[PDB]
Amino acid sequence: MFLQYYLNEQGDRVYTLKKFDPMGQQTCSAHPARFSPDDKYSRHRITIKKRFKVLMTQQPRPVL
Amino acid sequence: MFLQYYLNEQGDRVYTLKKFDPMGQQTCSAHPARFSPDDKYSRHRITIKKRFKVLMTQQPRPVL
Amino acid sequence: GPPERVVLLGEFLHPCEDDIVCKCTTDENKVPYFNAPVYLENKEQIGKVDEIFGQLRDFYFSVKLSENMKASSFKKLQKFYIDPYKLLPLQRFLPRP
Amino acid sequence: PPERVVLLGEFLHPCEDDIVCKCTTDENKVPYFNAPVYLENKEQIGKVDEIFGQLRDFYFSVKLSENMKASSFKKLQKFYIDPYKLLPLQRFLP
Amino acid sequence: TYQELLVNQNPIAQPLASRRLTRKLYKCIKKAVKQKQIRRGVKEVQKFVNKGEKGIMVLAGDTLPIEVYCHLPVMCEDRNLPYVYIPSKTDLGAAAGSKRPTCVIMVKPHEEYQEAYDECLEEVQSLPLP
Amino acid sequence: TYQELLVNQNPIAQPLASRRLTRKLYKCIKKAVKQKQIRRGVKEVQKFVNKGEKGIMVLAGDTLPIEVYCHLPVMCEDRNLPYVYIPSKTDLGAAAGSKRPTCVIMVKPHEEYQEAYDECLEEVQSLPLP
Amino acid sequence: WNYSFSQLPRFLSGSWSEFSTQPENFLKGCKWAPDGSCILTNSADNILRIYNLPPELYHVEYAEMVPVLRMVEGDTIYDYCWYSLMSSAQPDTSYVASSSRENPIHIWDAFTGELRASFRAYNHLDELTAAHSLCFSPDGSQLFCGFNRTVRVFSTARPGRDCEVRATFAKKQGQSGIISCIAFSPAQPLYACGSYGRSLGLYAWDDGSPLALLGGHQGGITHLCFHPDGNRFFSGARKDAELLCWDLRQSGYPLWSLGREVTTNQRIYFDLDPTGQFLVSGSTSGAVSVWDTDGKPEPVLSFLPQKDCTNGVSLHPSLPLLATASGQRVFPEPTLECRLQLWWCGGA
Amino acid sequence: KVAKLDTSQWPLLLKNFDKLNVRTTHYTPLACGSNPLKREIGDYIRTGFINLDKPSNPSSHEVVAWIRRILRVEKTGHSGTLDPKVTGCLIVCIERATRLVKSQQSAGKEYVGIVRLHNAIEGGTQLSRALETLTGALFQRPPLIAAVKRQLRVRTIYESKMIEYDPERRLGIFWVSCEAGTYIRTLCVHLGLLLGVGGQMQELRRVRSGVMSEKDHMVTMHDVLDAQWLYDNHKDESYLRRVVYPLEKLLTSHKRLVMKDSAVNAICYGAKIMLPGVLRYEDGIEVNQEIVVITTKGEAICMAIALMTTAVISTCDHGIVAKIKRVIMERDTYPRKWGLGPKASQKKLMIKQ
Amino acid sequence: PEEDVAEIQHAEEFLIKPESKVAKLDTSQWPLLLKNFDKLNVRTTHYTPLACGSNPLKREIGDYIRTGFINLDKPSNPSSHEVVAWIRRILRVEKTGHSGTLDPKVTGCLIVCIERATRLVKSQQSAGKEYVGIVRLHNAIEGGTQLSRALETLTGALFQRPPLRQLRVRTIYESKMIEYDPERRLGIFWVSCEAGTYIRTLCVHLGLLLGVGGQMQELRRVRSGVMSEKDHMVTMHDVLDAQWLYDNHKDESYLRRVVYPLEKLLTSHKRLVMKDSAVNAICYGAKIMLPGVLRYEDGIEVNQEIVVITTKGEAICMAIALMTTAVISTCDHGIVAKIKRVIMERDTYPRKWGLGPKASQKKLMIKQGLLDKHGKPTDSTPATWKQEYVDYSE
RNA sequence: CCUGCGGCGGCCGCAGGAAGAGGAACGGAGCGAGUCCCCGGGGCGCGAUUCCCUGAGCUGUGGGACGUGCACCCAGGACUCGCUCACACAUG
């Protein structure tokens, strides 16, 4: 997978083929992580996402 | 009993087993004084709590 | 006496003060009766269900052992079996619609 | 062999084992898939495999016959098709 | 060492005894315990202040919460009994030959330490009052 | 370079190995690569940890998205395995003897290099919680 | 070899250095295993230690003793004991019972030092209550243990909360207080319970029905020993000068009184010979006294193991070895190390 | 000086009233109510509650018995039992505030307790993991009572935390946030089984009862006795007015619905809350949601169930905004002013004519 | 001062004073289809609300999931049919659909509609979509300007053919070059296009048009109609975890961040607020007549697709507007719109048609034999009724 | 004629309808009773031999013994059958 990105000042994705930003740091991979339906690590993912305050519920609430 | 506490810089109770807090001061017992309904020392407690400006009526009034 | 058949109740985890703590692995996540006899696959009674604890879909149970049994006898991941009438469905403990 | 032939398009730069051509057909009429492409003398060059571009001005690639080669054709060399394997824009447009 | 215990004092722990007066009071308690002439608990001290038994009532100034013993200063002022605070409850218990602390002790007078008692009594009554 | 790699870091990448501990870990990995004791990638490490193996699980702190490997830290805590985040993904793959980056590897013990393994293991066991 | 206190006991190696790890540590008795293989010691650090019988005895200077096991408890250890029918030839018999503050009665394996079993005593509210005393039955089938106003009887074969409860105080009548010690008659089918409430009680083994209730002592009773006759027994108490001699015949009143200095709230142990002729006791002053039981017990000897309280004394069941445990609670002031010791008491 | 205060500094249920949606600004004020903080001391106590710090010997029903001797009132309730040896936050509602007890008893609690382990574990992290395992919806056997075996039930633990661990005594402090009716004694037994070493709850303290906590407004039993004594002997209210708080403080989380003074007495008599009487209404009122209906002086009239959403109220001109759940205010606090309005007058006129 | 504020709170009297100024609402922060509810033109305020439905955001969790959708970030192994089948299995739900088929190796926005939101799938499948792909050129090119010129040329209504059928027309609205790498001959392109546009085919045509030849290396969908990749986008792990957290902790919080109500898809459309009595009639397939219109939005035109909503903000149906805004404001009677697609279930709101004055009048005349059994006139009908009553069947 | 659902992009089949869109007191409250839900002998005080006790037994900010007295064991919610007060669209 070649497609990378870095976030703009506006907040939207700036797509790129390079593995570093203009400002030095690493570009993230555009595609989401692989998933399989047999996964039984929901407890595990939630448990540490709570610890570091990165669970989706703990983020600022969206504008509707 | 076993539970002690000391107040942090924003007035929250920080519970602990140890008799001294991290600044070397004694920790208070978590539990209030034992009460008797036949207590006849109400005059006496008001008398010196007034004297040392620590009666509840002399403190800053709570914001509701 | 010995029941006609027995269904998988759970598997052995660590002992705890002369009774044995077991992870519950029932089909449809069914919950055992309190003081329900626990059997090995040979249909011999090892004890009775004492405590039931943990999350709804990942729960444990302790087993108060029989007169002749010892908690040192059992091996890790050893399976235990229960009379299927002595289970209840998880829906019972889940809230009313 | 065709009875009569009508212009199909002019030669554009070649591709890998094909020749890309800009269509200049009368009333912009679109050629059929797998239709035989001819020279001015009714000698077949190849067969039309892919058709692409905008509805008014479009291009077509020609899968060459085994005898021909892509590099040999001159700049703006004209190519032809039988009129029975053409279609109007009004089928595709609405 | 004395100034470190001074951090732990209550809002109501006055008059606090001077460093040398604190040492006199401990030595008087040791002699009174040997003679079997003290009262230790609030439970006890409260009972014999009610009966009207005289003595120097020594209080621990780091006692919390204050509700356990803060009625006692006024009980003394009703009967004109001399009372005084001292830096710590652990040392007050230690003065009576005990590993566990106590928040109050009342020292009764007796012949064997009458001069030491009167020396403590004299300075306790001389203290400035808040 | 170590201090520069903190800019690239991941929200869940703690406890992070120090500059010196990172150096010690690479060399323990390289020794384990020669003896073929390590296990590479999520699919293999997840399989072997579930199967029953023990050792040290070295995670990469540059990994994104976090969903690829954020389940592993708790898989260790269920079986009391020690784990630690090193700063880079590309350095972990180079130390592991591969041409591309890698997000996680598990180093198993061996009689050939127990001195280096013990220095890392005890320092990793000693790491404070965030 | 046979016991003889015509001479002062000769010194034999003890342990002092490991007890000095904590500040103000002190021993809380010592007890030989009933086969005589090793000695068990309690201490203020809440660590039971087992010391093997010295190899240099059978092999002169002796090195400082080192314990083969340390088995740690998390709270004050109220009582501890060897299994009644222990033999070092059988791993199934070699184990140590131990009770501690707000904890179960733990059973420790005497070879490996692992927690082997737990007996648990709950009150009517289903809250765990700790046993203040322990005693195995003379068959080794049951484990008797004392509480406030009640004895419980666990079956040694089935470790757990299951137990036969025996109330000693019912509608303000009977033996009151915390039952601090139990002991069984070698000949008769009975056991004697001492309490921190002044009284002694005798009870039938099979039923737990009261046979007698005895006064005498002026403090809380701390220890009991039956004579190998079966008729005669002895008792001792805390903050109480007299060690009282009793008899199952001519009961109701103690036959004799033996003086010893006890000025603390401590379990100052005393022990008889295996033959039953001598009786040895510790003291808060330090002086270990010896009496010949064979009339009133005659004073034989008094000697000083150290300049400190001798809380524990234990006599070896086959050999003439006296063990002595030392130390006590130090009391503060506003702003010698304790030790186990062995002693040869054989004849010239 | 009230003119200088921002609306965010107005007391209790009148806090941030300008950010409610305004239906109409016109009504006729009546000299009937007071602000809940300025009620005459009798009325103030009869509509009040105490955020008590329970002592460690008596049962929770004994404690509220003692409070009703002291204050000299006939009714009290207590926001969930604390066991005799447990301390901490016990909301004691007095008289007319006892109408709120189910909302206080059903609220989420928090506890700080000590578990004693019966053998050594590896360390504090092992206890911390067993607490994470007992987060979420848990099975717990309710204790036997009068030989009536209650069935196994489910109770949620929202958060857990391991605060401290002492390897010497094998003691561990834990903080637990949980659903009402959770047994923390049972939690410590399970926490012991899960570790394998065994365990018991040594000690317990409740640090939160829903809206109230030990952080602020909490008083001990001595304060309650002491404040009453000062009122009995010196006729001073000042101490009692800091011990007792008005029941409106318990309702500050609820969505509000402000009514005209004409409507107030009608609602106290059992009239449904109609739309022509609504002055202001909060954002986020949903259907079948429990809301607080208040006067323009900030007094709680009733707990009502909303039959119109916020948006529906904005569009309509008449009809049932809410039905009553429980009436808080007495009848005839305000005068009868119903039947005087335009449509209701037209109805009675056209019946007569 | 904090203490000075506390002192004023207990001393001085507070009152929400009477005023004569007009009561002005601010509905700009209200959720979804209730946003700027104040700005709608009001026909009437007189009706009886029913208290049966709910605000879309505050439906109970079962009803919330059944009337909702997920802006999914599709993972790169499975097909789009397989992905919605997983979500169907996870959420323990009967039916599921999506907003456009992405190929197995393509990632990005996939609006997975659940149960009753699957009535919108035809509208979501026809919506305009944006992609970011990588074209892999077989031979080298002079510069990135040539590949941009090829994308400039293919902006417009194009001929296209499916991958391995008939020739089809597909418009590409906008196209752009992000960057190009001459070493590996890869070029990132972004394209906005109509639904059903084949991007594999576009990459081949870029290759043919340049002369070098080419193909699609990989693809990602960044927009699907209204939803984008920076608008509440969620992964399959989140969907699985959110369901798990609801199962084991009884916590709906995570599901309500993952799933959103179908009304969030309809926020672009013009609104027609119906009276609560008219709601169930429309769900059964009635005409949207004038007596039931409470409010109507500015700038409604004839043949415009409008969303018809309740007073609580629920979507009843998508509909075609027959009257303009100006006509609805001035007319006495008529058909305001006709149903395109009924979203709301039958008997969500109760069954309250035929109870009105003019409807009850017609029922009475049929009972009296003044009209026929099928509500049609007779010779005996009064000239007042016959002239006034404009029967819409005609 | 409309809608919904399913089958193979229009038709087929099945199902629900045929809809003009009503109602400015509907049908409430507060008590009391019966039945369910909820629903871990102890707590407090004083007296005398300082009533005993710094126990290694919790414990003097409290533990125990004997006298003695005292106050606790509800309050809520739901259902059901009474009594009381209303039957209220909220006065520009």
CSV table of C-alpha atoms in Angstrom, one decimal, chain F:
chain,number,residue,atom,x,y,z
F,1,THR,CA,18.1,11.0,16.7
F,2,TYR,CA,16.3,9.4,19.7
F,3,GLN,CA,14.8,12.7,21.0
F,4,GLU,CA,13.6,13.5,17.4
F,5,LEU,CA,11.6,10.2,17.3
F,6,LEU,CA,9.4,11.4,20.2
F,7,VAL,CA,7.7,13.8,17.7
F,8,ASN,CA,6.5,10.8,15.6
F,9,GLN,CA,5.0,9.0,18.6
F,10,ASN,CA,1.7,7.2,19.1
F,11,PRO,CA,-0.9,8.0,21.8
F,12,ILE,CA,-0.7,4.5,23.5
F,13,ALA,CA,3.1,4.1,23.2
F,14,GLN,CA,4.0,3.8,26.9
F,15,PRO,CA,6.0,2.7,28.7
F,16,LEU,CA,8.6,4.0,26.2
F,17,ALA,CA,12.1,2.5,26.4
F,18,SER,CA,14.9,5.0,27.2
F,19,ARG,CA,17.7,5.8,24.8
F,20,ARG,CA,20.1,3.3,26.5
F,21,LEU,CA,17.4,0.6,27.0
F,22,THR,CA,16.5,0.9,23.3
F,23,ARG,CA,20.2,0.2,22.4
F,24,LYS,CA,20.3,-2.8,24.7
F,25,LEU,CA,17.1,-4.2,23.2
F,26,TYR,CA,18.3,-4.0,19.6
F,27,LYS,CA,21.4,-6.0,20.4
F,28,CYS,CA,19.4,-8.7,22.3
F,29,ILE,CA,17.1,-8.9,19.2
F,30,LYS,CA,20.1,-9.2,16.8
F,31,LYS,CA,21.5,-12.1,19.0
F,32,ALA,CA,18.1,-13.8,19.0
F,33,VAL,CA,17.8,-13.3,15.2
F,34,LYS,CA,21.0,-15.3,14.7
F,35,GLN,CA,19.7,-18.1,16.9
F,36,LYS,CA,16.2,-17.8,15.3
F,37,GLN,CA,14.5,-17.3,18.7
F,38,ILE,CA,12.3,-14.2,17.9
F,39,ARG,CA,8.8,-14.1,16.5
F,40,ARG,CA,7.9,-11.3,14.0
F,41,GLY,CA,4.7,-9.4,13.2
F,42,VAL,CA,1.2,-9.3,14.8
F,43,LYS,CA,-0.1,-12.6,13.3
F,44,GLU,CA,2.9,-14.7,14.6
F,45,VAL,CA,3.3,-13.0,18.0
F,46,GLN,CA,-0.5,-13.1,18.7
F,47,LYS,CA,-0.5,-16.8,17.7
F,48,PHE,CA,2.6,-17.8,19.9
F,49,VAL,CA,1.5,-15.7,23.0
F,50,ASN,CA,-1.9,-17.4,22.7
F,51,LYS,CA,-0.2,-20.8,22.2
F,52,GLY,CA,1.7,-20.5,25.5
F,53,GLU,CA,5.2,-19.0,24.8
F,54,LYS,CA,6.9,-16.5,27.1
F,55,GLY,CA,9.6,-13.8,26.7
F,56,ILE,CA,9.7,-10.0,26.1
F,57,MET,CA,7.4,-8.3,23.6
F,58,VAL,CA,9.0,-5.3,21.9
F,59,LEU,CA,6.4,-3.0,20.4
F,60,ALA,CA,7.0,-0.1,17.9
F,61,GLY,CA,5.9,3.4,19.0
F,62,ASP,CA,5.6,4.8,15.5
F,63,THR,CA,2.7,2.4,14.5
F,64,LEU,CA,-0.4,3.8,12.9
F,65,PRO,CA,-3.3,3.0,12.9
F,66,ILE,CA,-3.2,1.8,16.5
F,67,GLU,CA,-5.9,-0.8,15.8
F,68,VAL,CA,-3.3,-3.1,14.1
F,69,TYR,CA,-1.6,-3.9,17.5
F,70,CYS,CA,-3.4,-2.2,20.4
F,71,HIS,CA,-4.9,-5.5,21.6
F,72,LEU,CA,-1.4,-6.9,22.4
F,73,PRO,CA,-0.6,-5.0,25.6
F,74,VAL,CA,-3.6,-6.6,27.4
F,75,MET,CA,-2.7,-10.1,25.9
F,76,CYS,CA,0.6,-9.7,27.8
F,77,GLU,CA,-1.1,-8.7,31.1
F,78,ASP,CA,-3.4,-11.7,31.0
F,79,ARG,CA,-0.3,-14.0,31.0
F,80,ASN,CA,2.1,-11.7,33.0
F,81,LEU,CA,4.4,-11.2,30.0
F,82,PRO,CA,6.7,-8.1,30.1
F,83,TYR,CA,6.3,-5.6,27.2
F,84,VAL,CA,7.9,-2.3,26.1
F,85,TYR,CA,7.6,0.3,23.3
F,86,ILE,CA,10.7,1.3,21.4
F,87,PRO,CA,10.7,4.6,19.4
F,88,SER,CA,10.7,3.4,15.8
F,89,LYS,CA,9.1,0.9,13.4
F,90,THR,CA,11.9,1.0,10.8
F,91,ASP,CA,14.6,0.4,13.4
F,92,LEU,CA,12.7,-2.7,14.9
F,93,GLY,CA,12.6,-4.3,11.4
F,94,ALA,CA,16.3,-3.6,10.7
F,95,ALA,CA,17.3,-5.1,14.1
F,96,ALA,CA,14.9,-8.0,13.5
F,97,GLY,CA,16.7,-8.9,10.2
F,98,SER,CA,14.1,-7.8,7.7
F,99,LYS,CA,14.0,-5.5,4.7
F,100,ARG,CA,10.8,-3.6,5.8
F,101,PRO,CA,9.5,-2.0,9.0
F,102,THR,CA,7.7,-4.1,11.7
F,103,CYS,CA,5.3,-3.1,14.4
F,104,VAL,CA,5.9,-5.9,17.0
F,105,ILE,CA,8.4,-8.7,17.7
F,106,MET,CA,8.7,-11.1,20.7
F,107,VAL,CA,12.2,-12.1,21.9
F,108,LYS,CA,12.5,-15.5,23.6
F,109,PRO,CA,15.3,-16.5,26.0
F,110,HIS,CA,18.3,-18.6,25.1
F,111,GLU,CA,21.5,-19.9,26.8
F,112,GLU,CA,23.7,-18.1,24.2
F,113,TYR,CA,22.8,-14.6,25.4
F,114,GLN,CA,21.2,-14.7,28.9
F,115,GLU,CA,23.4,-11.9,30.3
F,116,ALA,CA,22.1,-9.3,27.8
F,117,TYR,CA,18.6,-10.7,28.0
F,118,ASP,CA,18.6,-10.4,31.8
F,119,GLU,CA,19.8,-6.8,31.7
F,120,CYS,CA,16.9,-5.9,29.4
F,121,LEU,CA,14.3,-8.1,31.2
F,122,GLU,CA,14.9,-6.7,34.7
F,123,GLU,CA,15.1,-3.1,33.4
F,124,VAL,CA,11.8,-3.7,31.4
F,125,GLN,CA,10.1,-5.3,34.4
F,126,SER,CA,11.2,-2.3,36.5
F,127,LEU,CA,9.6,0.3,34.1
F,128,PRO,CA,7.0,2.6,35.8
F,129,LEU,CA,3.4,2.7,34.8
F,130,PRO,CA,2.1,5.9,32.9
